[PDB]
Amino acid sequence: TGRPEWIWLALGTALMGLGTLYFLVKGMGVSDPDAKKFYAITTLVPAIAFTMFLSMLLGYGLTMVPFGGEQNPIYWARYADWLFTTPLLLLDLALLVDADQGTILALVGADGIMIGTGLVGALTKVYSYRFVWWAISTAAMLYILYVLFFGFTSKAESMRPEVASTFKVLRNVTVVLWSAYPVVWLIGSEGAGIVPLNIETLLFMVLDVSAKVGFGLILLRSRAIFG
Ligand SMILES: CCCCCCCCCCCCCC(=O)OC[C@H](COP(=O)([O-])OCC[N+](C)(C)C)OC(=O)CCCCCCCCCCCCC
Ligand SMILES: *C/C=C(C)/C=C/C=C(C)/C=C/C1=C(C)CCCC1(C)C
């Protein structure tokens, strides 16, 4: 009966599910208050992803948008996942380096703009204006990456070296993974239409699992989260 990207939505669901269960069991077993905060934020991340992957697998979160002369499938539920999960990831990073309150507000604001303007782009009917929204979104993304690379690293230098070195691995993972998203959007079913929907779903699933479960495994096994 159903669409060919179903298999990657199914594999996504299973990996986000097992990662959530694993983080939950390890988290409930620790007593340190600082570690526990990291566990709570980091378990919630793949939990939200699991629910959105499951919804899309069962045929929700999907709409048709007319552009370029034809009717194009667009998965909007992805944006509902990212709207909450991307700022939770940034909060992990900010807590790890003791970032200022004003910095966090600015980053979460920027992140909201990135996801909101990405979604507006995805839903826009005049082909060339899709890319105006994409460009605004990518600018907001680049501001985030600049602040993580220059501002957060400088804050990390005032921490003990094992905290600084955990931050640097997470930072490097984040910059590499996050910088690929605007490229997948540009060339896939939301932008140019070159890479088909099934392969695009495969790419976003690998990126998402790496950015959430991978990131999580690295953070939650470090000594850096302990009080
Ligand atoms: C990360 C941020 C960096 C990117 C920022 C700028 C990059 C340089 C892009 C400029 C190229 C476009 C200029 C052009 O060349 O001509 C103008 C083009 C004609 O468009 P129009 O005749 O429909 O009316 C438009 C008139 N109006 C807007 C009032 C309705 O202005 C447009 O629309 C607007 C489309 C341009 C903005 C989005 C850039 C395209 C990005 C990549 C596209 C990739 C293709 C695979
Ligand atoms: C768990 C999900 C993660 C870590 C997702 C990150 C998603 C982005 C960095 C998305 C960025 C986008 C742009 C830069 C422009 C166009 C569309 C967006 C949402 C895909």
From Swiss-Prot:
<dbReference type="GO" id="GO:1902600">
    <property type="term" value="P:proton transmembrane transport"/>
</dbReference>
<feature type="topological domain" description="Extracellular">
    <location>
        <begin position="59"/>
        <end position="75"/>
    </location>
</feature>
<feature type="topological domain" description="Cytoplasmic">
    <location>
        <begin position="93"/>
        <end position="103"/>
    </location>
</feature>
<protein>
    <recommendedName>
        <fullName>Bacteriorhodopsin</fullName>
    </recommendedName>
</protein>
<dbReference type="GO" id="GO:0007602">
    <property type="term" value="P:phototransduction"/>
</dbReference>
<keyword id="KW-0873">Pyrrolidone carboxylic acid</keyword>
<comment type="similarity">
    <text>Belongs to the archaeal/bacterial/fungal opsin family.</text>
</comment>
<keyword id="KW-0157">Chromophore</keyword>
<keyword id="KW-1003">Cell membrane</keyword>
<keyword id="KW-0681">Retinal protein</keyword>
<keyword id="KW-0675">Receptor</keyword>
<feature type="transmembrane region" description="Helical; Name=Helix G">
    <location>
        <begin position="200"/>
        <end position="219"/>
    </location>
</feature>
<feature type="topological domain" description="Extracellular">
    <location>
        <begin position="124"/>
        <end position="130"/>
    </location>
</feature>
<dbReference type="GO" id="GO:0005886">
    <property type="term" value="C:plasma membrane"/>
</dbReference>
<keyword id="KW-0406">Ion transport</keyword>
<keyword id="KW-0600">Photoreceptor protein</keyword>
<comment type="function">
    <text>Light-driven proton pump.</text>
</comment>
<keyword id="KW-0716">Sensory transduction</keyword>
<keyword id="KW-0472">Membrane</keyword>
<feature type="transmembrane region" description="Helical; Name=Helix D">
    <location>
        <begin position="104"/>
        <end position="123"/>
    </location>
</feature>
<dbReference type="GO" id="GO:0015454">
    <property type="term" value="F:light-driven active monoatomic ion transmembrane transporter activity"/>
</dbReference>
<dbReference type="GO" id="GO:0009881">
    <property type="term" value="F:photoreceptor activity"/>
</dbReference>
<feature type="modified residue" description="N6-(retinylidene)lysine">
    <location>
        <position position="212"/>
    </location>
</feature>
<keyword id="KW-0813">Transport</keyword>
<feature type="topological domain" description="Extracellular">
    <location>
        <begin position="188"/>
        <end position="199"/>
    </location>
</feature>
<feature type="transmembrane region" description="Helical; Name=Helix E">
    <location>
        <begin position="131"/>
        <end position="150"/>
    </location>
</feature>
<keyword id="KW-0375">Hydrogen ion transport</keyword>
<feature type="topological domain" description="Cytoplasmic">
    <location>
        <begin position="151"/>
        <end position="168"/>
    </location>
</feature>
<keyword id="KW-0812">Transmembrane</keyword>
<feature type="transmembrane region" description="Helical; Name=Helix A">
    <location>
        <begin position="6"/>
        <end position="25"/>
    </location>
</feature>
<dbReference type="GO" id="GO:0005216">
    <property type="term" value="F:monoatomic ion channel activity"/>
</dbReference>
<comment type="subunit">
    <text>Homotrimer.</text>
</comment>
<keyword id="KW-1133">Transmembrane helix</keyword>
<feature type="transmembrane region" description="Helical; Name=Helix C">
    <location>
        <begin position="76"/>
        <end position="92"/>
    </location>
</feature>
<dbReference type="Pfam" id="PF01036">
    <property type="entry name" value="Bac_rhodopsin"/>
</dbReference>
<feature type="transmembrane region" description="Helical; Name=Helix F">
    <location>
        <begin position="169"/>
        <end position="187"/>
    </location>
</feature>
<dbReference type="InterPro" id="IPR001425">
    <property type="entry name" value="Arc/bac/fun_rhodopsins"/>
</dbReference>
<dbReference type="InterPro" id="IPR018229">
    <property type="entry name" value="Rhodopsin_retinal_BS"/>
</dbReference>
<feature type="site" description="Primary proton acceptor">
    <location>
        <position position="81"/>
    </location>
</feature>
<feature type="transmembrane region" description="Helical; Name=Helix B">
    <location>
        <begin position="40"/>
        <end position="58"/>
    </location>
</feature>
<feature type="topological domain" description="Cytoplasmic">
    <location>
        <begin position="26"/>
        <end position="39"/>
    </location>
</feature>
